[model samples]
Structures are given as C-alpha cells and as structure tokens.
Target: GKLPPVYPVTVPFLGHIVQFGKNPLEFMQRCKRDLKSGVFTISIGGQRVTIVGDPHEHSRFFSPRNEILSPREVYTIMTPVFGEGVAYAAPYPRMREQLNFLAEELTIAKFQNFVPAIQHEVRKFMAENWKEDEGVINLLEDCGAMIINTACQCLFGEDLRKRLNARHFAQLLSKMESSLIPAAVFMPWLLRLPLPQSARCREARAELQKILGEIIVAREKSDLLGGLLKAVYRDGTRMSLHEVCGMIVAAMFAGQHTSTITTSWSMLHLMHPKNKKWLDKLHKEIDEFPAQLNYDNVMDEMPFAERCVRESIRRDPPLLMVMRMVKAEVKVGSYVVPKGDIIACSPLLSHHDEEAFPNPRLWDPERDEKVDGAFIGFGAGVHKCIGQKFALLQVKTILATAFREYDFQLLRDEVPDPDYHTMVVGPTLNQCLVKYTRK
Candidate 1:
C-alpha cells in the first residue's frame, strides 16, 4: 500500500521519455507486466504517471470531486492553446462553471436546430469530395475534412465556413496541435521560442482568437450565444471578449479532433468485409427513418448506426488515455498514490480486456450493453465528455447520409494502425482508402 510500485527509469532526469516516446502502448504494457501492479509509476516526458488500468479502480481515478486529483494540472499543456485565464488556466470553480455553461449551451434544442446544418454539410462534402464515378477517397482525409466542416458550421457558426476553407483551417489546427508535443508540457520555455512549429502555433492561435473575437463583437444575444456578442457564465457573470474567444477556441480545438477521428475510424471499419452486415443494417435503419432526424428522434431512429459508432470507438478510441495529476495521497486498489503523481487511465486497455469483452479485437455491434466504467469511449464520471451527444449525432448523420447514397468498398487489404504521434489517434490519412458506387 506504499505509493504503489515504482517502475525504474533508465534515464536520470528524463524518466521513461525514450520508452514512452518510442511506443506508448507497448511501454505501458511492459510496465504493467514487469511491475506486476495494475497501478504503478512510470514517467512520461519527465512527468510521473501512475498507470491505472484496472477497471474496478476507474471510479476513484475519475472522481469529479476528488481534490486529491486534478485533470487541470495534467492538461495544463492546453493553457497556451486555450489562452491565459481561460479553461485550464482558470480557477477550478470557474472552470466547472464554464463546462456547465457549455453543457447547457449545447442542449437538445440547439442540436435540433443544428440537424439541417449537419445534413447540408455532409451532403455538400460528399458531393464535392467523394468521387462521382468509381474512385478512391482516402477515408481519413475526406472524412476528416467533412467532420471538421460540419463541426465548425454547427459549433462555431456559418461565418467560419464562409471565411475560411477547410484545407486552410485544417492546416491551422495541425500547426496548433504540433506545439502540444510531449516536450512542450515539460519544457514550456521551448514553446516560447521562435521555432517554426511554435511560431505557427502562435499565429494560428492569434488568427483563431481574432476571428472568434470579431464574431463575438458583431453579434447580439440570440439563442445559446449562436449570434450572441456576450456570454453569460453559470454564475450570472458575463464573459469578457477574450474569455469568450478562449472558450470558443477551446471548444473547436477539442471537438475537431475527437469528432473527426471518430468519424474516420467508424467509416473505415464499416467498410470492412467482415462488418458488411452491420453497415447494411445501419443503411436499412436510416432508410426507414422519417425524412428528418432532429435531436428529439435521432437517438431513437439510429440504434444500429449508434451501435456501429460505439463499437468503432471501442476498437480504436480517439484518445487512448486520460490523465490526472494527483494533488494528495489517495488509496486506489490497495495502493497509495502520493501527491504530485500523474494518474493515467486507459480506455484502450479496458476495451481490449478479454475478461470484460469477449473477442475484444473484433468489431461487433451486437455486444451486450456495457455497464458503467466498462465502456469509457466518451469517458466516465462528471468529467465525461460534454459534447458526447452532439458528437454521436453528427457521426450518425454522416453514416446515414453516406451509406444511403452509395455503396463503399475498401481499396486496401490491410487496415492502417493508428498513428499515435499526432494530436488525435486514428488511422493515417494516406491509408484507409475506399471507393464508392451510387446505390
């Protein structure tokens, strides 16, 4: 029960950077096996993380009120991207208020309003990006573009779509994410330098902030701040222009990767030969639905499609691991995690545990409904993803629209493994090509 077990690091100061940087999953598995402790110490990029893979221990790791653990500390790297005094930089109470505001803002009514926009974006993206005749569309690239366009249109507003093309917007996102490399978290000084990546990141941040600031300035209060110039926080206080920009930027940044990667991975998996039945089932279900799919009925209308998305997430989550910085001594599964340690819980690990999921590697939408903590694709506890319903609806809309329009076939025999080096974990853009024929 003494501070869990510590995994020795070869490097003096770096601490498992070499091992983790080379292969994160393999390194974690090795530590789990060698240490013989589900919860054990292993440093990443010079920060010590206690890997908590045991499913029974997840509740403690995910406790929303646990002052002994703070997600803000682990995600402080996002401070630069979200701007100072916003999101991760804000006090805990303020941060909770902001999250609550976001949850309230993205209500069912708002998503109902967004249905037509999501449909329109998907239709246009498919028409323009998907080949009219028989040709291959790279699943990652095309789906990613479509998802980003849809997310921006719905979340940020139509002004973003009219102002910038997806290619340029994507480049900005890439540059911004590049600055989040592991080293940036440990050595914040490097991000301040005039390095190419750092400069691009800063430029992107400034440009995004400027755009959002302008939108906030030009608009007046409407429903859910869609066209509102002022944002009211949960505490009845108005957010400053700078704070509003930071919130929008943070929402866009977080939503973009998770939605895009999940879309790409789901589409890629649905194209597999073994998974053809699931695809067909989704297609049939969508065909039977009424002409419209508003927020009130989308969930009820797309059970098969939803299952496919859920299974895809289970197979390859957009985020492989979630982390928290321990603030004080905490007991988890007979082990005491000391203050100042980072605790990591892996969705990937839980999803693949054969004990919890039989044939865990295979894509099976028919699997029994998962209990709490068993399936953490969108995470668990109070810190669970706020945009989960929105994300699922968006992805489901894409599948319904795409599969209803065309029959898709995978062009490659080998499935591309996820590229973990990037901001979002998903199949590489160059691979996972699929050709489509009009239904």
Candidate 2:
C-alpha cells in the first residue's frame, strides 16, 4: 500500500514552517483542502511530519504499541525538565510504571479533601487581591496565581510551602517552562549547539531538585510527595530522589500553565455579554451549593459548569498537537505510514472538523460531537493524559468559588482570540483584562 498524500514543498528547506507559526489553523486547513485528502504530509526542516488530520484515522495514530510507535525521540526536549531517564524519555515499560505511579497519586482516592483545600486557596486569593468592590485585573495572570496556590495547598505539607512557597515556585517553574524550545522537536540540531536558555532550564530544575532533597531529609508530608516517595517498582527497587522530584515537577508543570489557560478561556467566554444565557445556566447549577464545597458538590452535582470547562478546552486545547515517531510501518485506512517519519495527531485540527463538530468556531456548552470520539481534548488510547480529572477538578473548583463571589465584565467587545504563539495556547494575554465586581 502507498503512503498518505504529501503537500508540495514551496520553500526548498523551510517547508511550511513560516505558515504554521503565523496561523496554524489557516495553514492546516489550506493543506487539507488543497491536497484533497484529510491525511497528508508536510516537511518541517526535512522532518517528515505526517499529520493524522482525519478523526476517523485517529485510532491508527494512538493505538499502536511503542514497539511500532515511540514518544521518546519526539519528546527529547522534556528530558531536562523531567530529568535524565525518566517518564517518556525512559524505557517504555519503566515509563508506564512511573506514569502509573504518578497516576495513582492523582486518582480520586487521594482527592477526598481536595475540594475544601482548593476552595480555601481560591477564597484566600480573592480576599487578598480583590479587596475593592470594583477593579480591573488580568484573568490570565490572576488565574495562574490561583492555580499554583490551590495545587500547593492541596499537595504539599506546610513546611514544604514555607521553604518553597507558591510565589517562589511560580518564578522557578516559569524559568523551566520558558526554557523549552518547541522548535527543537523538529529542528533537532538546534539543541545540540550551545544555548543559554538550556542552561537556565537545567538551573531551574536543579534548584527544585535541591530544595526537594533538603525537605525530604528534614522530614516530609503525605499527599503527592508522600505517595511518590512511597512508590516501589516491579523490580522491588525504590525511586531515586531525582526521579521523585522529576515526577512532582512533571505533575505541577503539566497542570500549572495548561490548567490556567483553560480556566481563563472558560472565564472569558462566561463573562462575554453575548453568552449571558450560558452564564445563567452555570449559576443555575452552582447556586444550590453550600459555602463549604465537598468532593461531591464539585465532582457530581455540577454538570453544567463541567460542560463549560470542557467546551473551552475543546475550542482551544492547551497543547496543539501530540506526536509519536513511527518505528514500524503501520497501515492506516487506505494509506500506509512508513517508519522513521513523525506522526502527529492535532487536537486543534480535529476539533474544528466540520463533520465532527459543526460550526466548530461557535462556543456551545450544550452541544455534543456529531462524530463519535471526535473530542480528544485530553487525548485517547495509551497516550491518554492521566492528570485530566485533576485538571478538570481544579478548573471546576475555581469556577464554583470565583463566580459565586463576583461578577465580571469583559473590557473587550468579544472573547479574546486564542493566542497560538506560545508553547501552551491561551486567550490573548493583553485582551484578557476584565472588571470584577463583588456580588
């Protein structure tokens, strides 16, 4: 069988790179239309990026075992942040066990008291910052602070917070995040050369690791850190401090920026005057809740607010694409993908598919996907993101608490356009100014 259609390369070496950075959606839509095939290939610095653009063929991209498809090479940039020989960079079996270890820490069993802890941090944050009845604040900035504060309160013990408080952790984590060069994924040589950003990234991770060691030796607390410390492998081996710190960094890094982006997108939509009907529906669902929210109050009773959060992610998924390299030739529908090429499944591309999600640009919390399994905001199959539930819980807890205390006005005429230039996409930062008035 032959491979998927390849888009003609117009600019000899750079091949589609400029267009992708400018407006990924418009460029991809053009290729999908011009090629007359939903599945196609484009070159990014000679790296054969075969896009699994068709939602029907998504299974072919996600369901393969690592023996046939591997994430290690594609995600090499994460090595510095996740530490050497850990998670996706580790051997496949060991990676699974460690992710399962991290997953166990995030599961609902450990989530019993998390709601009140989250609520406390959100309320505390509001009381401290929003003292005036009327004031303007950036939704994206304030949301990031609340996300970091709430996560630390729920996961870390008091001593850990004092040693590395929320504000301190935020600065260091920003260093680690800023150090990432997504271009390195395709332009592999860029990382091989000397770079100052790379040094800073390592420096940031080193400090986090050093602080964790000091905290661990002095004494410890039981939650995420405790669970990771208590973890044991199939070989009856204990995890090293490096690995433990890597995972904690992994979990926090994953949730911090991405969850912050999702919450801000949700808030931008809810505050827009045009979406008043949707806002009313959210209050209708949350108004019945008591002041002290329990796990059941957030997890079970609030379906409408949950829908709003899910729709925001659907509209602008934090991570535009997930990738894996083909290690063996795999047949996908009528086309065969060869080994050595990179296979990318884009949530952004698939979410906007007309057949799957009609009028995909419009935000509607009540709408369901016309095509089954088309909404993969959190991914699917073996590549599914484990921390999705915790991310959602964090978003929902903020929604219930924040909206209950205040009303907001979007200073702009419409919701902020999704800013695609950053590593993790969010609402346009400058356009996210909102006026919050106490209820």
Candidate 3:
C-alpha cells in the first residue's frame, strides 16, 4: 500500500518552501529529533525527500551499480544556476569523466602552481583599495572578487579575463545562487514576477553566457587549448561543445562560489581576538619562509590554517546539506524507504553534533584531534567536490598572504548573519568589516 506524504513538520505550500524559509537548518534539526536513525520523509510541494544520515545510503545512491538513481536529476534544481540542459541533460558518464578530469587538473601539484598568480592578483586589487588605510569593505563580496580573479587567471583565456569584470562575476554568481531553491518552489509563478531575483538572473545569465562563450571560443581557437581543455566522455571518444560547457559552467560555479564563502568565513572567524592567537601562530608558521609564497611551501606548512578552514566549514558549510533520490526499495535501519524518496545527509548537523564535537558552538581551530573524514566539511563519497584541493589552496594562499602583510579586523562591531537564498551560504546581514595596515 502506498503511504501518504509524511514530513517532520507541517510544511505549508506544495513544496517545503514555507518550512525551508522559516528555518532551513532548524527544520533539519527537527527531523533529527523527530526521526530516529536520521531517516524521515518530508513532502515539500511534490518533492518527497527521505532524509537519511547513513553515508552508505548516500554512497549507494551515487554508485555506478545503482544506475537507476541519478545524481544529475537530484541536482536539477541547479539548472538555473548552471544553465539549463547543461547540468540536467548531460549524460552521466560524460559528467563523471569531466569531474575526474577536473580533479586531476586541479590536483595539488597543478593547483600549487597557481599560487604566485593569486598573490599577484590580490596585491593588484589591494593596492588600489588598501590606500584608504581604514574603510568599510564588504569582506564577503571582496572574498568573492579574490576568487574571481583567481578563476580568471587559472581557468579562462587572457583575452576573456581582460574583458570580464571579476566584481560583476562575483556579484552575479552570488545573486544567481540566492535565487535557486527559493520561496518560488511552492509558488512557481514567482519566477516570472519582475522581482529583484528575476532581474538579477536575467542580467547575470546574459553576462555569464556572453563572457563564457567568448572564453570557450577563444580556447577552441588556440592550439594551447589542446591540453588545457577539460576532457569529456563520448562512448570511447572525447567531448562535444555542449558537454564541455556543461562541465565548465559546473566547475566555475562550484569553484568560484564555494571558495568565496570559504575565504569569507575564514576571514570572519579571524576577526575575534580569542581566535587571533591561533591565527597569529598560523601566520608565523607560513611567514617563516622568505621565499615567494607557493602552493608547495604553503601546503608543507599550513595545518593551523587548514584547521581554521576546517572549523569554518564545520561551523558553517557552504552548503548545509546534500540530498539523494532512492532508486529502489531499501532498508535503512528499521524504515523501508521506497524508491524515489529523497534522503538528505546534513554536514551542518553532523559537524555540529555535540556528541561528535565537544562545545560544538565554539569556533576553535586547534581542534585537530578529530578525524578529518568525520569533519565531512567537504562531503564524502564519489560525488565529493572535485576542486576541494583548489578551493583550500586558494583560501590558504589568500589568508597566508593577507594576514602576514596586514592586520585584519572586522569592519563592524556586530557579527553578521547569513542571507540564505537557495544553496549559497555566506554572511548577508552586515558587511564583514575588516581594516588592515601593512606591517
């Protein structure tokens, strides 16, 4: 017998739009309290997502043996963010191969080489702005800019980089991410409304497509693009333009946006004086080198910084949760979660569990005794973030360089709250104020 849609709470609206907006993290916490073994079915609109805590199930859903279950479809909400057809229509093998290639290209060795370039980009921007000595700058937005410059240097062609506005790229990407998984889920018509989101999406999409098209075309024209090109799968063959674009957009969105949040969170944590001593030691560790800052140099000696980043992501993961759709009947603990039920694994929940982390709320970077995998800040299993290394490298490079040279502080007296719109998570309330002078 088919069971009626069951949810932990009375999620108003056809979708979980109401409950989600009311309090997303809390809504899940309610599930953990309400559903034993971290399994529950929540009907948010027509979507029936079965929340699952077990990593095995999450891993099973994305495994090749479970071909019936599709991660791309489960992640279709990102079609708007990554561009339609590209994310949803691409074949599974093609996407997976592309992911592998990205991970390979973004490996520690290759990614380390990009550090000198990032330092140059950061210095160029800081030269223009740091002249103010003291001023109110939005650290969140600025961090996004830093990632954009890094992206331009490493990913796109020089001509396209020159034409693109890193500031606008950062702004547009943030705005677009905010619109995904919105109040509109229950009210689908809201997307058509001339709300700020619609405007931002339109402008952002227009600019994004145009600029990306130029880069794609320029890379195609260059012989150098041969090796730099992202590999894609086609039978036993290579990738097409559509397939390549799918991977490129997906790669860019993940790398640029997540690094932005990670960098911003790291900077915000350092604002606290209590957090400063550890950060000082962190800088001292990296500063001992008179050599130019490079990935190998930083990687060899960035554990405290890595721990700080681990804490920030644990405290506030860029995306609080990851979801999957069950392909067939499965026994998760005592519950029988039928096919097509959506299950969620929450990093925010697991990372903050007092049982898992002592004094869970405190921001302590020195807490390195914990196993790295339990941290789960980057997620686990095959579909894990491909550019995880690149993301961390950029964060360490930016922080190590900035902290050693400048005295960073919050621009405002109050801690800012996040403005969660869809999957994008970062401070939305106040501009993370920071003032620094070259030491």
lDDT winner: 2
| Candidate 3 C-alpha lDDT tens digits along 269-380 | 8866767688767867877865468767767777788888888888777777776666667666556767776666777766766656777778788774243344666766
Give the lDDT ranking, best first: 2, 1, 3
Candidate 1 Cα deviation (angstroms), residue 231 = 3.8
Clashing residue pairs in candidate 2 (N, C-alpha, C atoms within 3 angstroms): none
lDDT tens digits, residues 387-408, model 1?
Answer: 8988888888887777777877
Backbone clash count, each prediction separately = 0, 0, 10
Error of 1 at 77 (Å): 2.0
| Segments of candidate 1 deviating more than 4 angstroms | 12-23, 64-66, 158-161, 164-168, 186-204, 220-230, 290-293, 369-372
lDDT of 2: 0.88
Residue-wise lDDT of candidate 2 within 89-205, one digit each (tens)?
788988889899999999877888899999999999999999999999999999999999999998998878989999988887887877787778887777678778777777778
Worst 10 residues of 1 by lDDT: 220-229
Say which candidate scores most in TM-score.
Answer: 2
Q: Of the candidates numbered 1 and 3, which has the greater TM-score value?
A: 1
- 1 against 3, candidate with superior lDDT: 1
